[PDB]
Structures are given as structure tokens and as C-alpha cells.
Write a protein that binds this ligand. Structure first.
Ligand SMILES: [Mg+2]
Ligand SMILES: [Mg+2]
Ligand SMILES: [Mg+2]
Ligand SMILES: [Mg+2]
Ligand SMILES: [Mg+2]
Ligand SMILES: [Mg+2]
Ligand SMILES: [Mg+2]
Ligand SMILES: [Mg+2]
Ligand SMILES: [Mg+2]
Ligand SMILES: [Mg+2]
Ligand SMILES: [Mg+2]
Ligand SMILES: [Mg+2]
Ligand SMILES: [Mg+2]
Ligand SMILES: [Mg+2]
Ligand SMILES: [Mg+2]
Ligand SMILES: [Mg+2]
Ligand SMILES: [Mg+2]
Ligand SMILES: [Mg+2]
Ligand SMILES: [Mg+2]
Ligand SMILES: [Mg+2]
Ligand SMILES: [Mg+2]
Ligand SMILES: [Mg+2]
Ligand SMILES: [Mg+2]
Ligand SMILES: [Mg+2]
Ligand SMILES: [Mg+2]
Ligand SMILES: [Mg+2]
Ligand SMILES: [Mg+2]
Ligand SMILES: [Mg+2]
Ligand SMILES: [Mg+2]
Lengths: 80, 123, 205, 156, 129, 82
RNA sequence: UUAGCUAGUAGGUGGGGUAACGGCUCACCUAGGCGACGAUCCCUAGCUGGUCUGAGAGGAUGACCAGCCACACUGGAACU
RNA sequence: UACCCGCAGAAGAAGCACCGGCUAACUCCGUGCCAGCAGCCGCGGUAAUACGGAGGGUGCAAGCGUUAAUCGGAAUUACUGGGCGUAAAGCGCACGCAGGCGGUUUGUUAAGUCAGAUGUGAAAUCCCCGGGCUCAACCUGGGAACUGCAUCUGAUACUGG
């Protein structure tokens, strides 16, 4: 109903902000091979609730910062 | 040749250089004659090829063959080279346009007459 | 933009008749139709594979009198249109106005048929048409107009049309000096010595 | 009734104590305007003698080709020793679109509508072997129906 | 390693035909039965049979017509190193329609001709010609 | 403001006008919003030389688009022929 | 035969600021951020619809027409 | 102005390249490794179809050649569509992280994939069927196409989870 994406959390060291690797799976435009392509996004989280290696689900919002325009909605597979 | 290898390192082509670099992708360039002289050719041939060392307009110093029989070419003469090499001369890559800005047409030539800048002989 | 030289010289090079003269006098009398023109005309050299493809295309051009740039455009149109490319190439040549004037026998030769077109003597569906390469759609009438109806060479040309074979796809009225291009001709309607496949292979290098 | 085309003549040599001995080779192919195609390769001291030996061997060892109406039946490939060869069934009246030695062998084969391309070495002896090898294993809609044990209509 | 079982199936058919073997056996699979289902139905092999409980062995009974082999050519198209998916408009015609292309679709594994009549495409397993 | 006007698209000496909807600050033959028909002033007998999608034209005028002086003649001529 | 780059830099809080979000600006706090899926640096370059070629896939290209962008002696700045 | 009508008389209107092989089209005379030609192979040293003129011919045509430039032929950077014993080409050998890939069975997921629908993919251009300029170039109506992306609804064989 609303557009959202998923991915691993790469780092969480800066407060109220995490960086999330969304790994899309595209075809090569020439050779036809399917290549994993990784997209890093800076995501605003309230309360610093995510960790490294965490899978997260994010949505797009108004720009919070210079490099940050994304906010998570919920967390799946929190633990190690 | 493996499809993973071409993703990581694609098929790079061969940037082919031009064998007439002084023209600089122009059809003809105006030059000034520095030295008009003759040259003996490679080993299967034997002649005295009339060929001139030319300072061009863009700044390059190339030598240029003078086609046809006879030429009124001197030093400090303003000619127009066009590109196209003489095989049997080492290093000559250009042809002078006969009939351009100082060079005269070939005297009394009646076949392939436009390749040497000679008017139609009216009866 | 027309060939103006000797006409049997073209027929001597091709080796056969191209119907470039009216056929009043027999063609073997006016020229050596079995000998190519020039000093070295008696010799028949071993003609190459590119030679027989050129001589076939130079045969068909010199019949209709079409230069190469315009004849190239008929190949582009015939390859574009559906069906057999070579048959469409002949169907476009048979659609020319100066051919229709010749096939109805209003001019004795195709050049004379061209000049009647070129000198504003032909009306197509009532309207005068000045272009030799005008395409003539089916179910169209095409007539000698009023002023040139009293020409000597027109009704003399209808005389020579009776010696020639009557084409099926037309319907001429020699009294009114008009006709009707009823349909486009079939490949079987035309000559059978023309190897149209040699021309198609030539423009497909 | 068997139309005969020579493809290429060639002068070869053979060095002996006296010097060079020259000889001539001739590559000819025959065909009936239908599936019977056959090529020949003769060699003698003289050019009219060499074509006659080539025409003699070409008239036997014919091979049969299941043609379509005037074209091939499916895009088939043929190789021999330098010459991978592609040829393709084509629409009506497009002509023989083929190169050099391949033009002569398909013309006496009785096809009239091909789209061809000769890759690799275009040596006329091996490329005329590559088309004959290419045309021989081309199979009909009848041949695949009897082989697979179905009707022609179940194959479409 | 056994990177691809399906290309092992096709190669054992191809080497089986060229060696004039009567039957060819191999370890069975859920996908290998569906391919042998098409090859028996389309007429390239005589019969298939899966035997055994712990490790099932798929046995293919080959088919020979007039001495020479029925399966003239058999090739793998989509492979684990490079997958091939086609839409229903871009399904191939093997040997101008004489051969078949075994295509894996959402409604099971079928031939390319039945894939067009079903109106949906998928992954091209192999060309059999 | 948004307007409805002609646009010269023809050969030399033989004009042909696309009647388009455009922001009036754009160029004549340049950027436009919606093509709502055409007009042919060298229109022969037995062909249409004027066809205007009047449902779209009445849609943009309801939005407040203005009409050119020549277009308002052509909206009249459609409503007199039809 | 460019491997490291970045201190308003990365983020937070609050203030200011804009038509509007925002390091956009400022104070403070945190130590981040980017990078081998090529950061940074260097050379070249207006981009596209398209055009040319080619059977196709591709290659080459961006004159005319049209869309967007940039610039108006050079370097700057703001006013209305 | 287009357009149309009248006048007069074949008048006022053909050139350029090329002709050894590739490559369509040949002879003669000058010339003697000179003068010169030339894209490649190569021609010229006294009988030159290769140089220059002539005759003849061939290709084009109000143009024709030359040069520059791009793709093609070139499957000669090969995705389609190549190779690596000896022709250019397997690292001296091995372990191994990232990466690529992965036996078999069931369930589940729907990411890939597949299907449908919607939105969008400006117009022109290209293509198709027509229409209009005496034809064509050109102009133009309708359509297809824009092979893409997004969202939604499914499908579950295959691949992934
Ligand atoms: Mg010449
Ligand atoms: Mg010359
Ligand atoms: Mg012209
Ligand atoms: Mg056609
Ligand atoms: Mg080779
Ligand atoms: Mg009026
Ligand atoms: Mg703030
Ligand atoms: Mg610039
Ligand atoms: Mg190609
Ligand atoms: Mg200035
Ligand atoms: Mg300024
Ligand atoms: Mg010749
Ligand atoms: Mg001598
Ligand atoms: Mg002599
Ligand atoms: Mg020559
Ligand atoms: Mg090339
Ligand atoms: Mg290529
Ligand atoms: Mg190789
Ligand atoms: Mg060696
Ligand atoms: Mg080696
Ligand atoms: Mg080794
Ligand atoms: Mg190593
Ligand atoms: Mg598996
Ligand atoms: Mg699954
Ligand atoms: Mg999915
Ligand atoms: Mg879909
Ligand atoms: Mg018309
Ligand atoms: Mg468009
Ligand atoms: Mg699974």
C-alpha cells in the first residue's frame, strides 16, 4: 500500500542514524547475467534501536539531513 | 571469455590512430613550402620523386608528394595538401593538390584531367 | 538526365533486342546485333559472375530508360513492399506513365512515348500529367489529349502496336486514342528472358 | 539436364630435380535444379583437361537434398576444416544471397531463396564441402515425422 | 563438482545416442522426470522409468530410427552460470519448428509450442533438435 | 496563461496548422501541452481541413484557457458545418 | 602507471534562515561519512528525443527540428 | 506567384571518372627503372592492355572524381558470435577471504521469473495503411512502435529466501 524496501544495516555508530545496504538483483544490460547490486542509504531511526547486521524495513520521507531522506518502519531478524 | 570475466573486465576495442594526423580530421590544410627537393624511393623502384617539406598552418612540419609531371614549386610557396601516402617513399604521407593557391596544373594533360587541376581544352 | 547517344549501340552491348527502335525496319539490317560495339567487338570474353549481374541490370535499365539513382529508388520501394521483391521491381517499371503510353502503342518507341508525356500531350483521368515516371494506379484511364490527337506520329504508332503482342492488363481504344490500365501485370505477363533475380542479388551486397 | 559450374581454377606446383613442374586444379559442382547436388575436384597438366576430370567425378557421388518449394527448410550449419557456414531459408524471390563458392553450389542445388554467410576460412574447396555437408543433414518435415513417430501435422 | 544435474542428463543422452547404447541411466530428480516426460511425449525417447527408493535411478530407453540416432542435437540453453528467461512472445523456434525447446513455465515443464498455446512463457531448459 | 492556438507546421508556401494547447510564454512551434486537432488552409475539396476535439477544447476553456482569434473562428465553423 | 578521501566534514540538539525540506547557516555535542559495486584525482565532454551504420545485437554520433540545462567582454555582487 | 493559354523555332542546354588483377570495360603510338603511376598486389630497364597521348570502351550523369570522417565487410574484443599442446595466449605450484556457483526431498515465501491490468514512456522522427501538392522529394490523418519503468492483481515449474 506504501512503498518500502529492505536490507541489512551496515553501521549504526552515529546517533539517530543508520546506514542500510539494499541489495537489488538486476540483469546485466549486455551479457544477460543477473548481478547483485548494492545500494547504501542513510536512514533515520528514532531511539537508536537497530544494530549492526540487523535486517530492517525502511520507507522514504522528507529529507531529514544532508545525506538522509529515509526512515524505517519496522525490524525483522533483530538478533545475531 | 567467461561471462563473469566480461562483467569484471569488458571487451575493450582498438582505438585506431589515423595515418594522416596532420590534417586533424580536415580534408585539406594550407601549407607553406619550406624545401622543395627530390628523393630516391625504396629498393624495388628507382626514380627521383618530387616531394616538398611543408610547414602547415596548424603548426606541423610534414613532407608532401607533388604528383604529376612538372611543377612550378619554389620555397615560400603556399600550397594545399590533402592526405594520402606514397607507398614507395619512406615518411611521405600527403599529396599536394595540383591547382590550389600557388600550384599550377600539369601542362598538356588530357586524361584524368581533374585530378591535376587542368581546365578542359577548348577547341 | 537522359541517354542521348546511339540506341542500337546499347542493344549491341546487351546482345539482344531491347525494342529501342520502332521495328519498322528489321533490327538485324540496321546493326550487327550479334556483335558488341567498338573495335574489340568481335571478341566475347569470359564474362565474370559480377558481369552477368551487371549486364542483367543494365539490360532492364536500358529497356525502360531509367538512370541509376532513380532505378535504385525503385529497388528500395520494391524491397519495401510486400511479396516478391523482383516482381515488384518489374511492377513498378510497368507502372510508369511512359511505359503505359508505349504499351498502349501511343508512341512508337519508349523514348517517343516519353516525349508525348514530356510535351504535355497525355491526360490521365482527364488531368494532364507531365512526368514520365508518373505511377499509374489500376482502373485509370489515360488518353491522348485533344490538341495532339491530330499528330501524325500518334496514329502511326497505333499501327505499329498491332504488329506487337497485345498486353492483357490493358484495354486500349484506338479510335478514341485512349486506354485503361485495368490492373498491374503479373510476372508471367512480361518477358521471360529477364532474370529479375540477378538484379535483386546485385543490390544486396 | 545437369547444369555444370566451375567455381575456381588454380595452378599448383611440384618441385623436382629439373625445376618446377606446374599443374592445374579445377573445382566444379553439378546439379539438376533439384536436390541432386555433387561437386568434383580434378587435376591435370592442362586447364581443359582439369575441368573434364572435375566434371567426371562430379557427375557421380551426387547427394540428395530435401528442399522446400524454392528454399531451404530450417537454418542449418555446416563445417569442414576451415569453414563454418551458416545458411537460412528465406522469403520468396529474395534471390541467392550467398558468397563466392557458396553461390555456385546453391545455384545448381536448385534453391532460389537463401540467406547465407561463410565464416572462417573461405577457401573454395572446403567451403563447398561445408555446404554439401550442411545441406545433407538438413531434414524434411516428413523425415522428422517418421523419425519421431508422429504425423507432420503434430509437428506443424 | 556436480554443478548442474540437468546438463548431466542431456550429456548422457547425447553420449548415449552417439555410442549406440540401448538405455541410459542416471540419478533421478523431480525436474529430470519432467524433462523425460516431455522427451517421451514429443517422441525423442521410447520410454523412461524411475527405480529405487533411497537413491532413485532414472533410466531412459533411447530411440533409433533407420539405424542412426533420433536425437540429432541436444543443447543446454539456460545454465547455472547464465540463466535464460524469455517472455511468451520471444519463445524460440528450434529448427524452424521441427525441433522443440523444453521450457519451464509456471504451469509446469512443457514444450515451447504448448507454451504459446498456454499463453505464458518462462525459462528455456534445453533445445532438442 | 494557458492558451489554445495554432502552430505552423507545413512546407514553404503551403502551411498547415496544428491547433495545440500551450502555455502562452512558450514558442509557437515549441513546447505545448496537448494537441487537440489540426487546421489546413490549403485544404482540397473532398478532404477535411478542420478537425477539432471540442470536448477537450471545452475542457481547457473550463479550466480557464484562452482562445486565439483564429481558433475562435474555427470553433464557430465546426459548429456551423456540424 | 589516480587508492585512499573528508572537520560543516558525517550525525544529533537548539537558535537563525528560505516560498519550502535540509549543515542551508551558527553555537554546542557526538566521531563519524565516502571508498575496490572505483571514493578522491586527472583528461575529455552539454544531455536527451534522435541521426548514421548494421540482418540483428551492437558500434559511431548529438548539425538542422523539439524538450531540458548552462552561459551573455572577464571576475563578482545584489537590487527591483 | 502557382497555374493556364498563345507565339517562334531543334533552336538556348554534357560532362566527369575509369578500362593489369580485385573490378564492369582494349588496342595503337610516344617513353625506355627515366618521366611517372599507385587503395592493395605491384607496374616502368625498347615490342607497357598498369606511365603520357590517341582511338575505342565502361560506369555515372548536372554532376563526376579526390580527400577527410563514421559504421560495415571484421566472427579482426566474438552478449548474439572466437580462442589459448605446437600459430598471439593456462599464472611455477598451492592454500584461501570477498565474489561466482551448487546434490536430493517436503513445506513455506513470492524476491527473481511469468501473465494480466492500470499509469507513464512529449510531439516530431522511423514503420504500416491512407490523404494532399501534375509525380517524387515533401506535407499530412489514423495506427503500430517507443522493446522501458512504476504500481496492482495473479501464476509457482525453475532460481533465490
Ligand atoms: Mg585515371
Ligand atoms: Mg590513373
Ligand atoms: Mg537527378
Ligand atoms: Mg519485399
Ligand atoms: Mg582467416
Ligand atoms: Mg478560404
Ligand atoms: Mg537546526
Ligand atoms: Mg566544452
Ligand atoms: Mg555484423
Ligand atoms: Mg564575444
Ligand atoms: Mg556575469
Ligand atoms: Mg574485366
Ligand atoms: Mg628492358
Ligand atoms: Mg611501347
Ligand atoms: Mg587500374
Ligand atoms: Mg573495421
Ligand atoms: Mg564487430
Ligand atoms: Mg582466433
Ligand atoms: Mg615458437
Ligand atoms: Mg605459443
Ligand atoms: Mg601448469
Ligand atoms: Mg594470484
Ligand atoms: Mg539446487
Ligand atoms: Mg521456492
Ligand atoms: Mg516476484
Ligand atoms: Mg508483467
Ligand atoms: Mg498522392
Ligand atoms: Mg514519441
Ligand atoms: Mg526452493
Amino acid at each position: 500500500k506504501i512503498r518500502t524496501l529492505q536490507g541489512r544495516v551496515v553501521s549504526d555508530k552515529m546517533e539517530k542514524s543508520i546506514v542500510v545496504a539494499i541489495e537489488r538483483f538486476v540483469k546485466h544490460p549486455i551479457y544477460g547475467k543477473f548481478i547483485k547490486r548494492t545500494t547504501k542509504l542513510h536512514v533515520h531511526d528514532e531511539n537508536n534501536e537497530c544494530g549492526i547486521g540487523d535486517v530492517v524495513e525502511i520507507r522514504e520521507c522528507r529529507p531529514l539531513s544532508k545525506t538522509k531522506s529515509w526512515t524505517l518502519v519496522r525490524v525483522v531478524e533483530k538478533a545475531v | 571469455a567467461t561471462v563473469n570475466q566480461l562483467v569484471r573486465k569488458p571487451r575493450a576495442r582498438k582505438v585506431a590512430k589515423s595515418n594522416v594526423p596532420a590534417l586533424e580530421a580536415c580534408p585539406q590544410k594550407r601549407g607553406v613550402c619550406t624545401r622543395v627537393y627530390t628523393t630516391t624511393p625504396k629498393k624495388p623502384n628507382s626514380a627521383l620523386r618530387k616531394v616538398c617539406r611543408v610547414r602547415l598552418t596548424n603548426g606541423f612540419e610534414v613532407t608532401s608528394y607533388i604528383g604529376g609531371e612538372g611543377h612550378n614549386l619554389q620555397e615560400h610557396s603556399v600550397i594545399l595538401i590533402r592526405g594520402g601516402r606514397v607507398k614507395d617513399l619512406p615518411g611521405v604521407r600527403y599529396h599536394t593538390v595540383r591547382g590550389a593557391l600557388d600550384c599550377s596544373g600539369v601542362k598538356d594533360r588530357k586524361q584524368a584531367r581533374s585530378k591535376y587541376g587542368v581546365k578542359r581544352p577548348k577547341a | 538526365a537522359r541517354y542521348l547517344g546511339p540506341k542500337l549501340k546499347l542493344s549491341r552491348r546487351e546482345g539482344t533486342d531491347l525494342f529501342l527502335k520502332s521495328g519498322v525496319r528489321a533490327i538485324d539490317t540496321k546493326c550487327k546485333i550479334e556483335q558488341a560495339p567498338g573495335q574489340h567487338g568481335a571478341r566475347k570474353p569470359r564474362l565474370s559472375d559480377y558481369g552477368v549481374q551487371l549486364r542483367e541490370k543494365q539490360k532492364v535499365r536500358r529497356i525502360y530508360g531509367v538512370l541509376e539513382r532513380q532505378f535504385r529508388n525503385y529497388y528500395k520501394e520494391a524491397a519495401r513492399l510486400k511479396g516478391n521483391t523482383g516482381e515488384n521491381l518489374l511492377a513498378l517499371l510497368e507502372g510508369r506513365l511512359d511505359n503505359v503510353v508505349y504499351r498502349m502503342g501511343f508512341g512508337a518507341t519508349r523514348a517517343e512515348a516519353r516525349q508525348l508525356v514530356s510535351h504535355k500531350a497525355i491526360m490521365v483521368n482527364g488531368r494532364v500529367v507531365n512526368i514520365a515516371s508518373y505511377q499509374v494506379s489500376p482502373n485509370d484511364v489515360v488518353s491522348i489529349r485533344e490538341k495532339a490527337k491530330k499528330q501524325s506520329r500518334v496514329k502511326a504508332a497505333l499501327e505499329l502496336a498491332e504488329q506487337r503482342e497485345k498486353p492483357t492488363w490493358l484495354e486500349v481504344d484506338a479510335g478514341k486514342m485512349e486506354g485503361t490500365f485495368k490492373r498491374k501485370p503479373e510476372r508471367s505477363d512480361l518477358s521471360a528472358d529477364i532474370n529479375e533475380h540477378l538484379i535483386v542479388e546485385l543490390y544486396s551486397k | 539436364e545437369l547444369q555444370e559450374k566451375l567455381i575456381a581454377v588454380n595452378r599448383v606446383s611440384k618441385t623436382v630435380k629439373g625445376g618446377r613442374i606446374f599443374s592445374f586444379t579445377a573445382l566444379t559442382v553439378v546439379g539438376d535444379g533439384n536436390g541432386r547436388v555433387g561437386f568434383g575436384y580434378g587435376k591435370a597438366r592442362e586447364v581443359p583437361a582439369a575441368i573434364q576430370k572435375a566434371m567426371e567425378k562430379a557427375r557421380r557421388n551426387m547427394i540428395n537434398v530435401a528442399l522446400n518449394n524454392g528454399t531451404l527448410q530450417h537454418p542449418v550449419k555446416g563445417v569442414h576444416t576451415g569453414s563454418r557456414v551458416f545458411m537460412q531459408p528465406a522469403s520468396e524471390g529474395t534471390g541467392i544471397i550467398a558468397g563466392g563458392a557458396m553461390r555456385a553450389v546453391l545455384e545448381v542445388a536448385g534453391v532460389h531463396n537463401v540467406l547465407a554467410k561463410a565464416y572462417g576460412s573461405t577457401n573454395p574447396i572446403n567451403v563447398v564441402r561445408a555446404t554439401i555437408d550442411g545441406l545433407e543433414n538438413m531434414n524434411s518435415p516428413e523425415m522428422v515425422a517418421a523419425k519421431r513417430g508422429k504425423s507432420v501435422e503434430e509437428i506443424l | 563438482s556436480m554443478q548442474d544435474p540437468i546438463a548431466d542428463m542431456l550429456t548422457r543422452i547425447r553420449n548415449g545416442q552417439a555410442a549406440n547404447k540401448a538405455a541410459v541411466t542416471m540419478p533421478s530428480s523431480k525436474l529430470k522426470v519432467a524433462i523425460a516426460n516431455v522427451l517421451k511425449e514429443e517422441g525423442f525417447i521410447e520410454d523412461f522409468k524411475v527405480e529405487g527408493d533411497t537413491k532413485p535411478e532414472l533410466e531412459l530407453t533411447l530411440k533409433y530410427f533407420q539405424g542412426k540416432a533420433v536425437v540429432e542435437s541436444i543443447q543446454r540453453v539456460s545454465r547455472p552460470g547464465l540463466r535464460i528467461y524469455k517472455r511468451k512472445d520471444e519463445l524460440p523456434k528450434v529448427m524452424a519448428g521441427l525441433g522443440i525447446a523444453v521450457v519451464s513455465t509456471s504451469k509446469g515443464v512443457m514444450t515451447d509450442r504448448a507454451a504459446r498455446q498456454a499463453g505464458l512463457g518462462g525459462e528455456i531448459i534445453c533445445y532438442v533438435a | 496563461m494557458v492558451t489554445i492556438r495554432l502552430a505552423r507546421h507545413g512546407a514553404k508556401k503551403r502551411p498547415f496548422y496544428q491547433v495545440v494547447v500551450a502555455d502562452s510564454r512558450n514558442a509557437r512551434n515549441g513546447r505545448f501541452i496537448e494537441r487537440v486537432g489540426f487546421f489546413n488552409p490549403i485544404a482540397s475539396e473532398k478532404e477535411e481541413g478542420t478537425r477539432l476535439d471540442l470536448d477537450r477544447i471545452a475542457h481547457w476553456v473550463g479550466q480557464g484557457a484562452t482562445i486565439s482569434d483564429r481558433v475562435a473562428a474555427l470553433i464557430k465553423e465546426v459548429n456551423k458545418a456540424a
